[PDB]
Amino acid sequence: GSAAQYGRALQAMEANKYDEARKTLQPLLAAEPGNAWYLDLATDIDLGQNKANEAINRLKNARDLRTNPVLQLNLANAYLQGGQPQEAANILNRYTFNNKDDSNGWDLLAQAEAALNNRDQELAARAEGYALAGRLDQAISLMSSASSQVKLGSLQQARYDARIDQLRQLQERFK
């Protein structure tokens, strides 16, 4: 059934047999073009075969795109691999806010902001990745740098300094 075909395609995907995975997944996707998990696998297959624009157009056509975090993260990744870091960062700034514990989202945001030469944002996203990896001193260091780069007295500076305060008192529970 569909469960068997999905499992076969996912197994092929993980073995980097993209063509085999595609042939197995395609009839599932054609029948349910908005199934978030069929779209998730279709995105990985297309990006594996350097077809980011195909993956982008497909996700842009999904109804649940704006409300489904699986579809959001996939479209951000496809934009990043498709040479569109700006659209990726647009998605990822919302995604990381709504899914603060997801290290994949922070890593992707850090990649996008590095591609966009948005340095304090890159630093902040790298700091959040370090915090999720428990490297709290290092996260505070990078967040301190990010704070120091935006205009003194701005809300952005206040946000970064508030994150520093949150990281410090979290350190305290591990001393």
From Swiss-Prot:
Null allele phenotype: Disruption sensitizes cells to multiple drugs.
Where does the record say this protein resides?
A: Periplasm
Q: Where are the TPR repeats?
A: 3-35, 37-69, 70-102, 120-153
Function, as annotated? Functions both as a chaperone and a metalloprotease. Maintains the integrity of the outer membrane by promoting either the assembly or the elimination of outer membrane proteins, depending on their folding state. Promotes disulfide rearrangement of LptD during its biogenesis, and proteolytic degradation of LptD and BamA when their proper assembly is compromised. May facilitate membrane attachment of LoiP under unfavorable conditions.
Protein family per UniProt: Belongs to the peptidase M48 family. BepA subfamily.
Self-association state and partner proteins as the record states: Interacts with BamA and LoiP.
Question: In its UniProt entry, what is this protein called?
Answer: Beta-barrel assembly-enhancing protease
- What organism is listed for this UniProt entry? Escherichia coli (strain K12)
**Covered range of the whole protein:** 310 to 482 of 487
